[PDB]
Structure formats: structure tokens, C-alpha cells
């Protein structure tokens, strides 16, 4: 089963009489271990809220960051193992960069998501390599394709979501989204909401301690994936803290 020397977790070419693939499933349990990364689609952009894990006492900003820029206007928030996430960042950024060069217009998220998923999926099929141990979101704003949110898991699926969570708290965190009307809503108000969801979900045993990182890609940034200002972070932090009490 999990303790074995042939097939099961060694392979992923294996099937059980149920049909399952255990290795691809073990990769899914790996994304679960670290804290939540949420990314919410607005009709005007994407706002992310990520727990940025504080693994030491001698931190500087951007240390073990999970916010990546795939393209100029795509942000990528990862959850689960960061080792696998760095290799995934290089592959996604590379597919986007060449796209911009050739097509000369802003990469459609629907296209980018299909290509990275195929890559994850090529590894899950194979028993020759293991598959990535993280799950990620790509989120973007353009006026050539609209605001899009996509999610790619360790299996190799790409489907669009209008508000998603990956990481430990995601079953709880997702529920809070159904409460919110977020499909139509400014990116300014949604930052306040991603921050308050994270503060309440966190507990001292999903991970020791975190640093709040929120990111913009919307009408406010003018279609640029950038990190939120010091001002923005703090008011959204404040509202999270006041709601927490």
C-alpha cells in the first residue's frame, strides 16, 4: 500500500480495481499541509490573499514568498510544498513569455492553464517521475479577455473558478465565499474580505506564524500584477483584526 517496493506509490501507471491512482492522491495530501491561499475573481480583476509562512526570526520581505508573476498581468499563488512550486513557476512563466512574444497580446488564462495542467498531467500518468506536490491559482485582469481565475491541482485539471482556496483551511474558507457577492464587486472591497477570512482561519498548528501578503491585479493597478501598498495592507489587516476580536 504505502509501505511497498513495487507499484502503488512507486508508480502512478498503476490502477486499482476501483480505478484509483494512489501517488497522484499522495500529492494532493501534500498541498493540504500548509496554510491557505485564496484568489477571488471580480468583474474587474483578481485579488489574492496569501499566508506567507514565517519560518524563522530573521525574516525580510519576500522570503519564501508564494506570489509569483507568470505574465505581466498574471499573478500566481501557490499552496502546499514550495519546492515543487518553484519548478512550476519557471514552466508557467516560460509558456507565457513566449506567448506574448509571438501573439503580441495578453495571454488568455484559459490557454495558459491548459498548458501547465498538461505538464502536471504528463507526470501523473507517468510512473517514471512523481507529480508536483503543490496546487496553484493563476489570476489575472486584461481587457482583451476579461478578468479570469483559474486553478490547477496536482492531478492536471484546469477549470475556471470565480473564487477559489487551496491549502489547509479551504473547505472552511470556501464557505465564506458563498456568503459574499464577489462576482460583481470592486477589487478595493474584496481586499478587505480576503484579509479577514485568512486571520480567522489561521491557528497555531497549521503553521507557527504568518505575514500577510495581499496582491492586486485589477482596475486599481490598471491591469498590472503588483503587490498592494503599505497603506492598503494595513487597513485590510486592521479590518481582519477588528473582525477577529
Amino acid at each position: 500500500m504505502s509501505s511497498i517496493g513495487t507499484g502503488y506509490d512507486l508508480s502512478a501507471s498503476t490502477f486499482s480495481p476501483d480505478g484509483r491512482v494512489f501517488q497522484v492522491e499522495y500529492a494532493m495530501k501534500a498541498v493540504e499541509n500548509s496554510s491557505t491561499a485564496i484568489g477571488i475573481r471580480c468583474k474587474d480583476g483578481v485579488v489574492f490573499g496569501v499566508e506567507k509562512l514565517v519560518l524563522s526570526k530573521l525574516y525580510e520581505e519576500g522570503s519564501n514568498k508564494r506570489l509569483f508573476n507568470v505574465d505581466r498581468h498574471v499573478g500566481m499563488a501557490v499552496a502546499g510544498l514550495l519546492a515543487d512550486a518553484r519548478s512550476l513557476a519557471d514552466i508557467a512563466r516560460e509558456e507565457a513569455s513566449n506567448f506574448r512574444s509571438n501573439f503580441g497580446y495578453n495571454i488568455p488564462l484559459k490557454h495558459l492553464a491548459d498548458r501547465v495542467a498538461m505538464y502536471v498531467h504528463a507526470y501523473t500518468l507517468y510512473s517514471a517521475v512523481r507529480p508536483f506536490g503543490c496546487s496553484f491559482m493563476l489570476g489575472s485582469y486584461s481587457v482583451n479577455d476579461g478578468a479570469q481565475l483559474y486553478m490547477i491541482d496536482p492531478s492536471g485539471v484546469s477549470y475556471g473558478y470565480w473564487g477559489c482556496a487551496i491549502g489547509k483551511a479551504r473547505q472552511a474558507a470556501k464557505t465564506e465565499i458563498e456568503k459574499l457577492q464577489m462576482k460583481e464587486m470592486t477589487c478595493r472591497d474584496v481586499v478587505k474580505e480576503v484579509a479577514k477570512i485568512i486571520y480567522i482561519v489561521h491557528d497555531e498548528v497549521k503553521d507557527k506564524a504568518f505575514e500577510l501578503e495581499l496582491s492586486w491585479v485589477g482596475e486599481l493597478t490598471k491591469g498590472r500584477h503588483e503587490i498592494v501598498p503599505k497603506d492598503v495592507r494595513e487597513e485590510a489587516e486592521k479590518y481582519a483584526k477588528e473582525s477577529l476580536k
Partner: protein, 74 residues
């Protein structure tokens, strides 16, 4: 662990006990009077007949201690 089709043997002292254990969890006799705190190292080894959501209701995973948790243990 019931995945049986075992055309040759397969023990089945163990089969009888696996089925009897379900029966006692079922509401022929109460299950609001008997609670089961179950500890098993893996759920991979275990079969879904046992796990369900009306044999074992909560599924609580235990990750290995965090950094703060080990200082508390000490």
C-alpha cells in the same frame, strides 16, 4: 480489510469479526451510548466499509508537531 474476492483462503476469522463490528455500530443497538475513539496509523490500509461517515464520523488527521508544539512538549 475487506476487499475480499479471495478464491483461495483469505483467513476469515478476520472476515466474521470485520462484519460483526459494523453490526454493533449500526442502530440495531445504540451508537449514541457507545462512542469509538479509534487510532490507526493509516487510513490507506483501512477499507471504506469501516470509515464511512456513520461508522466514524469525524476524520481528524494528526500532522507531526509544529515548531512551537515541540517547545511546548519540552
Amino acid at each position: 480489510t475487506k476487499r475480499f474476492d479471495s478464491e483461495k483462503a483469505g483467513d476469515r476469522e478476520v472476515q466474521r469479526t470485520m462484519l460483526e463490528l459494523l453490526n454493533q455500530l449500526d442502530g440495531f443497538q445504540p451508537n449514541t451510548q457507545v462512542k469509538v475513539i479509534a487510532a490507526t496509523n493509516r487510513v490507506d490500509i483501512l477499507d471504506p466499509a469501516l470509515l464511512r461517515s456513520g461508522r466514524l464520523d469525524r476524520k481528524i488527521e494528526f500532522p507531526m508537531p509544529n515548531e512551537e508544539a515541540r517547545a511546548r512538549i519540552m
